[PDB]
Amino acid sequence: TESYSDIGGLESQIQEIKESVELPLTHPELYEEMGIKPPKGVILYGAPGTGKTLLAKAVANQTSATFLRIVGSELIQKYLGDGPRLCRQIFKVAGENAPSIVFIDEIDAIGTKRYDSNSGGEREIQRTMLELLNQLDGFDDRGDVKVIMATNKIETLDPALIRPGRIDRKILFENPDLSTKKKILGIHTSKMNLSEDVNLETLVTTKDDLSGADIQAMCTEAGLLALRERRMQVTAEDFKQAKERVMKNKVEENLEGLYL
Amino acid sequence: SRVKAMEVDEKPTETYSDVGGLDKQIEELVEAIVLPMKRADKFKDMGIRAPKGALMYGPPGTGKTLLARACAAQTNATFLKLAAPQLVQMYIGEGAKLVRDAFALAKEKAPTIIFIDELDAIGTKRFDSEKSGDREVQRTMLELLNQLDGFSSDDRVKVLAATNRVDVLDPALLRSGRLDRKIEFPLPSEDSRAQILQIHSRKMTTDDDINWQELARSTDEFNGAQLKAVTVEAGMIALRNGQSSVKHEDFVEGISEVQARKSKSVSFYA
Amino acid sequence: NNENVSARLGGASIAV
Amino acid sequence: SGYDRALSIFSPDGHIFQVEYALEAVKRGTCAVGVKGKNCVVLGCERRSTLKLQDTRITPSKVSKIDSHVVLSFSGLNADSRILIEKARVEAQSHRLTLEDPVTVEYLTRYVAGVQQRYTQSGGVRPFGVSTLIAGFDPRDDEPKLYQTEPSGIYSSWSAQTIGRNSKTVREFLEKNYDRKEPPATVEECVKLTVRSLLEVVQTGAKNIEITVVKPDSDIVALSSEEINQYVTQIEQEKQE
Amino acid sequence: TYADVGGLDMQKQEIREAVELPLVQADLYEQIGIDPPRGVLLYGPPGTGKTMLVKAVANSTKAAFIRVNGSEFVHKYLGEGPRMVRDVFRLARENAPSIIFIDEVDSIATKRFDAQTGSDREVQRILIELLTQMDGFDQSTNVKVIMATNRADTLDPALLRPGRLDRKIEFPSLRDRRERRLIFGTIASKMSLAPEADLDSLIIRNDSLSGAVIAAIMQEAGLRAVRKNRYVILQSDLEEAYATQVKTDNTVDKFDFYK
Amino acid sequence: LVYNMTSFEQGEITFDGIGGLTEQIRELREVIELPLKNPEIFQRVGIKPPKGVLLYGPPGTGKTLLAKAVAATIGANFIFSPASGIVDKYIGESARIIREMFAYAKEHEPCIIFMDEVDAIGGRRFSEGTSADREIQRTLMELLTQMDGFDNLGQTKIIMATNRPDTLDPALLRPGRLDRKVEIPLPNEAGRLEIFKIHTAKVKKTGEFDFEAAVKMSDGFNGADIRNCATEAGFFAIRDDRDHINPDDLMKAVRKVAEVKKLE
Amino acid sequence: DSTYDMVGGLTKQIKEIKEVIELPVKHPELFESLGIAQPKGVILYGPPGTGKTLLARAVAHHTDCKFIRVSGAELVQKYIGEGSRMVRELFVMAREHAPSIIFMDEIDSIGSTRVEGSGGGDSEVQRTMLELLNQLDGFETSKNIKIIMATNRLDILDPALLRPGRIDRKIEFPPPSVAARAEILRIHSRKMNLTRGINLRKVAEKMNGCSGADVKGVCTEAGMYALRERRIHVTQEDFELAVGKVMNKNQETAISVAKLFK
Amino acid sequence: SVTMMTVEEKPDVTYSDVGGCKDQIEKLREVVELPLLSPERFATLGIDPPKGILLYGPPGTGKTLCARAVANRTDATFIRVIGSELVQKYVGEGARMVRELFEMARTKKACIIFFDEIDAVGGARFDDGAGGDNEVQRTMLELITQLDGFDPRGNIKVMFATNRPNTLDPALLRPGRIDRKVEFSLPDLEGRANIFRIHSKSMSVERGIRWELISRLCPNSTGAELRSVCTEAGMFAIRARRKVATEKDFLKAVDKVISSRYMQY
Ligand SMILES: Nc1ncnc2c1ncn2[C@@H]1O[C@H](COP(=O)(O)OP(=O)(O)OP(=O)(O)O)[C@@H](O)[C@H]1O
Ligand SMILES: Nc1ncnc2c1ncn2[C@@H]1O[C@H](COP(=O)(O)OP(=O)(O)OP(=O)(O)O)[C@@H](O)[C@H]1O
Ligand SMILES: Nc1ncnc2c1ncn2[C@@H]1O[C@H](COP(=O)(O)OP(=O)(O)OP(=O)(O)O)[C@@H](O)[C@H]1O
Ligand SMILES: Nc1ncnc2c1ncn2[C@@H]1O[C@H](COP(=O)(O)OP(=O)(O)OP(=O)(O)O)[C@@H](O)[C@H]1O
Ligand SMILES: Nc1ncnc2c1ncn2[C@@H]1O[C@H](COP(=O)(O)OP(=O)(O)O)[C@@H](O)[C@H]1O
Ligand SMILES: Nc1ncnc2c1ncn2[C@@H]1O[C@H](COP(=O)(O)OP(=O)(O)O)[C@@H](O)[C@H]1O
């Protein structure tokens, strides 16, 4: 349901999905003018608390097309031979409902190496990882259905499907830099009072090794923390006690201080 | 119905000039299973528990599925060449009814031999998720085996079996009386490897100035399956270059193409 | 013919 | 893989690993900047203000001179840096002994790299988790120069360079400002050039810095804590808005 | 039974009041107003006579009773262990007032290290099947548990606290002469032996012993004589027997191993 | 049937038509037959009947032919449980099999076990992979409690055959049960003709006798040697279609087939 | 069930719970007027025998919302790919009753950190509840559902669980102070009897911070040293007896003379 | 039934649009076309060609296109036995299809098939033969029972595929079962320089380009990382809004897909 004008930060990251999805419905004559067809596939690295799912739900707000809802674990089934049928179902109907989009998330549940196990159940997902491959690039083209898959860790996972033919760009997210923490803070705080203390360009600062999601906890944890003082509007030191808290157990550099 | 669909392979057979080497293995067999089939008298009259059957174990590509075809037409003893899988398939009310019919007919047409395939699908030592899926299979073969002798039968039916794994099986078949003679198929030595090489090649066009010896020396960890295949691809090389024969070179590059080496071949050597 | 087999419908299994 | 747990083997790409993993250690260390004017050199540091229990009577010091016409600065880790500093100053005073002549700076710089080459080649040894640089003047001339060194064992001659945290911000910065079209002349602009260069990292703490410069005729001079504190302000004086 | 047990003059008392007395007399506990206890634990080395005491209690409880040794829990298909464990405690409260016995838990009750496996990770959540039952939102006032172990210093402290195991008990060592004299008199008196009765010659020895070895010596001494085409009595030349109960000599790894 | 033969308590192989021993077999006569025969004494003393036995030694001794044979004299059900063929890689399911058989044995009224190669149970644990070796005792320890719990029966006897004794020292499981541990022999040179007299019977061979057989049987003292020599010596009189054995084939047999029985 | 008079030992923690729970339910209008966020569920870590589960049975007595429970490992299951089904069929039962707290006592069986050599279905059903809390439709579920989970030591777990956006608070339940330890005696004693000329703070100050639940053990045990003798009433010296005893054995195996160091 | 549905029906792709694999085809069409086109030259020597060849290689190396490139070329029936159509539940409903699969083929002549990604079923080497019931064990032993033991047929060509060969049996390296193990592997320069050109036909770039620079600049890479170049290279001009491509554009397109510097060289 959300929109743009609700992120601010991700700009180097966001131009791609625009170039994959939001744009080609508009002005495909650009791509063909060169003699080129856009990607069939996208993926998003992890580094959590940085706005992955948020991005996907945004484009759903303005896409003028059919959009889907899957997490990696809805694919799997129990009867040992019906899982992989389900994958071919969703892709053919998308063609029937084309132009369409999908979104498979947390697919580290599915995507793992060919572990060569001995269980009897862990096999029936590997085949389920495989019809996808045989469906997605496989043998025959599929048309204009695009993938926006996500995860949280890939550095030893997602073996082979991560290649061109299936996915073409690999956006990655991290905890932001100092420059982005500026504008992102304006986002959440643009409904409160902010009585007179702002000083925000020292409130957020490097060595605040935090996320791009904890800030809204800090924003909201302060207001009630001021409310309980019977003061609805806000000052700075409301936020100071908060940042003292939420940062407390992120990291500790006790092994640092050696590289003098 | 499969028993009528199955028939003896007595009519087309290798004719036994095609096997190479294996001096003592077959000599062990004929001394153990064949001579008694023609001297049923003494092994009832001299008084002795005859060899009821025997087993051969060894790795693939080695002459298991083959050798059991030679001995039959060699000796004019009908049979069937059986398949553990087609028993084990989704049909369940026949795995027992079939094997009962198995020795039934082989009891007829006497004297006869009978032989089975790899026991990978019916070794079935496992007490895993459900035993009753298959325990009605072996136990009939056990009882059907017990039909063979025990009260001075001399039924003239004799049994053999091949399988790679001599360890996963039921340990109820090595028992005394039923069978006690498990045969090892060793992997071949060099003087044994070469007869395998000529014999899959006499049909092929060649020259006479080969020394087949070191070609065997180049091959270790190989036997018959690994051997004829290079005996194939040499001729396959002969056309792409355009020959009307196969030279010594074409064989040895066969070796280099078993595993696709494709060496740099000029890397600072001399 | 309601001989509906159990489908051999998998299930996990601990190792070693 | 397994190609990266030693110093005497090559990955199939051809490159060894344990060396450029050192370049990840040195990235975890403090800044160390250097610039040469027309006739004077400077050097910086990202000194820390850790806590109110280190003796102000003895501030620490990244910099460490070896002879009255050469200095040295580094970043990485200090223990493995302490050694080659002592193998350096030893080697220089020997060259005065044997030859009755001070050291050309290039000769020195090839001795410190002449050990960072063996301490990676022959196994049974770990490298020096440190990059360094040299600064000073040759005897009997005003020719300015600074050389860099790194644990692969190679020596270059930059005119400006840094090592460590957010160096990537800086080595692009001076490229945008410093240039051979207009080489600086004297101290107060080489320093006014440099004190602003630190600011990507210093986050406005002036208890977190030191500085030195260089003389001809085999001299040096250190610098105070107020003698920057004004330079904290002229650099901010431009930053009115 | 009780009278079949020898020298448990102390230990015998704590459980026959931590088990029998409440269901027969509980109104007096609350006549103060307190909640009585639920679990106990019996830790001592093997042969010290623990697994048999409950069997005496089994004869005399007038409640229900359940036997599950710790190895019975696990299976290959995960998830079924705990529901088996849940099947237990529901069966108990159903047939209440009831209690439970386990003969070993050291295969389960451990320290909960940092696991990185399936095996070592699935055993733990079995243990969690106990904790969420023994003290969670749904509890009761009819169940009691009789744990057991050959030794108890490793199983996690989260299991060891009040509410769970209010009364855990020790057992003697193997070198405590008073009960040793009490056992030989007990076991021997249950059957017929000789007048030449040199049993006040064996107790005095410095050797350590259990209640298990004693069943061996007095049986296998009853073996050698009954083997002698004899009828009842055991000759005073059972000196074979005591020395036949020297298993340290029968351990080459206790003879030619460390040196 | 599903598992094993059970011998129907009467399949009467001859425990004396054998070149084995008299002392050991009479040592076993005590622990099994005497109570089942004569409970008037163990009752009179009140001692419970015995708990199992071990029969160490490597093969050739016939340490399984006597077992089912004497079981046939008394008439119990003889089965197997080869520990090599009981282990399963899964966490449980090695102990489940133990639990089936003590139950299923009791489904039958009498029953006796013949475990073999039980060193698979009693391992030294030199690897010390706690994911595994924590379970090895788990299934083992279940045996100790599954075997002697409440079972106050006089029918369910136990045997364990264990080549390589004392390889096990995780636990010797000494105290209590194993009321005997028979000092097993090997086939002495005197016993050779005690053995050759066994298998030679049921033959018309002009005798086929010799004193050059124990010298041939020297170091080939395993029962399979004699079973097989009589086999192949039987295959040499037919090598020429003769009518009766000559003893030279025996002097040829054991001399020329104990070779494999001494080198590998 | 039990109640808030019985969970004495603290107020700062419990005064932070309904800071997130009771307010949005009863009074979101100010929080919609202020209109900023919606703080979702909570975690509470601490050593065992401290009152974690106790606060969670009380709160249900004082909630007015529906309060769903899952005990230890009743979601991990035998067959495959229905543990997830056992999850997504849970929350749909919540949204029927828009104000719905859930509770899961322990997560260290499920939500342990992930690896590849082992850990299958459990590391999958965690990888979809992690979706349900903050996904597309989770934004729908994110409206009114609240969550409470009560681990023992949290370093084991992932960060993604305790990552904010869904876990906005991480409460500590440490072992108490003297007066905290001192009161809960009364909360486990007032039923007892007209205890005769007695103090209870002089004994708490004897027993330094051990835990809370232990104190339920001394009081129940103290009466038992008086129960044997048909001495229905209660003594003083029976207390510093027992508390001096039951922790001795806890201080028995802590000793060791390895000392390869100083 | 369903097997009749899975049939190629003419995708458009040549051998002109494949590059560095200029010899690895010379093994592949040596077994397929010639016994079906020119069997007389073998017959002049009179021997048995191999049947049941295979190909294995890294992912995205360019094997599936060949398997359909050979389809339109031959003008013969092409058959796709793809996954999710061999391991359905209700045993008997699974392995009957493979029996029915060949039966269509045994009937018809001039026929070749395709097994896409056999690693599912063939790759299921029995886990130490464990499992009291192994549904894939039974259906793998049938096709080797089709193909080995005795001859299935005399004129039918078969090709498998595998991203990962070490899975399946040691019985699928063996004549009757399998004859050849072709290996597609990474290109060299003179192959890449003929893979760029095909993917840049459509592209609207202007000359002044020397891909010899690029191949020296693109190390070990697949035949699919070399099309993605052509996308992003052509794309950067779009956000920069130009109606033509440069060369320098490729130089910052190459840097992404392959993906702080080795200053020691
Ligand atoms: N720029 C931003 N503006 C507002 N909120 C942000 C921004 N970046 C991150 N967030 C917060 O981060 C949360 C989303 O985190 P993320 O996208 O990682 O969830 P996810 O896709 O499920 O991944 P994970 O499973 O790691 O949480 C949102 O709830 C949102 O509040
Ligand atoms: N002694 C031999 N003489 C001739 N050919 C041989 C010999 N040994 C092996 N071969 C060759 O090996 C192949 C036969 O191997 P065989 O079929 O007996 O093993 P297999 O049954 O395939 O093994 P498995 O049962 O494991 O599949 C034939 O190609 C045959 O030419
Ligand atoms: N401060 C307290 N107030 C009331 N009861 C307490 C207090 N501290 C301990 N208890 C008692 O301790 C027990 C609760 O233990 P606690 O809830 O701390 O462990 P737990 O969280 O249930 O363990 P887990 O949830 O890990 O199984 C109850 O019997 C309770 O009466
Ligand atoms: N020589 C080539 N010329 C043009 N494109 C190529 C070439 N080689 C590979 N490709 C590209 O590779 C893609 C197909 O990869 P392919 O399917 O062969 O890899 P794969 O290992 O079969 O993948 P999977 O194992 O998942 O089937 C095609 O989109 C194609 O553009
Ligand atoms: N006081 C005793 N009198 C007679 N027998 C005893 C006595 N104590 C122990 N035993 C013997 O020891 C055995 C119990 O061993 P135990 O230590 O309980 O092992 P576990 O606790 O592991 O089951 C019993 O079978 C019993 O014969
Ligand atoms: N004392 C003996 N007398 C005669 N034959 C024997 C004797 N011992 C063993 N055998 C022969 O060996 C076989 C038994 O093998 P055995 O040594 O019992 O194997 P295992 O030791 O594995 O049980 C019997 O079939 C028998 O023919």
What does this structure look like?
The structure is cut from a larger assembly and holds 8 protein chains of 8 kinds. Chain A is mostly helical and 260 residues long. Helices cover 35% and strands 6% of the residues of chain A. Chain A contains 10 helices and 4 strands. Chain A has helices at residues 14-22, 29-34, 53-61, 83-96, 123-126, 128-138, 178-188, 200-203, 214-227, 237-246; strands spanning 42-44, 100-102, 145-150, 169-171. Chain B is 40% helix and 7% strand. In chain B, helix 5 (95-107) packs parallel to helix 6 (135-146) and helix 9 (224-241) packs across helix 10. Chain E is mostly helical and 259 residues long. Chain E has 9 helices and 4 strands, in the order H-H-H-E-H-H-E-H-E-E-H-H-H. Chain E has helices spanning 11-18, 20-24, 27-32, 51-59, 80-94, 119-134, 177-189, 212-226, 239-244, and strands spanning 39-42, 100-101, 145-146, 167-169. Chain E has a 4-stranded parallel beta sheet, with helices on one face. In chain E, helix 6 links the parallel strand 2 (100-101) and strand 3. The chains are: A mainly alpha (260), B alpha/beta (270), C little secondary structure (16), D alpha+beta (241), E mainly alpha (259), F mainly alpha (264), G alpha/beta (262), H mainly alpha (265). The A-H interface holds A 15, 19, 30-31, 33-36, 38-39, 79-82, 84-85, 87-88, 114, 116-118, 120, 123, 126-127, 130-131, 133-134, 137-140, 160, 163-165, 168-169 and H 11, 59-60, 64, 67-68, 80, 82-84, 87-90, 94, 116-117, 119-120, 124, 127-128, 130-131, 135-136, 163-164, 167, 201-204, 222, 224-225, 227-228, 230-232, 234-235, 237-239, 243, 245, 256-257. One adenosine-5'-triphosphate sits between chains A (7-9, 48-54, 150, 152, 184, 187, 212-213, 216) and G (130, 134, 160, 163, 165). Chain F: This is 26S proteasome subunit RPT4. Chain F: Keywords: Acetylation, ATP-binding, Nucleotide-binding, Proteasome. Chain F: It comes from Saccharomyces cerevisiae (strain ATCC 204508 / S288c) (Baker's yeast). Chain F: The 26S proteasome is involved in the ATP-dependent degradation of ubiquitinated proteins. The regulatory (or ATPase) complex confers ATP dependency and substrate specificity to the 26S complex.
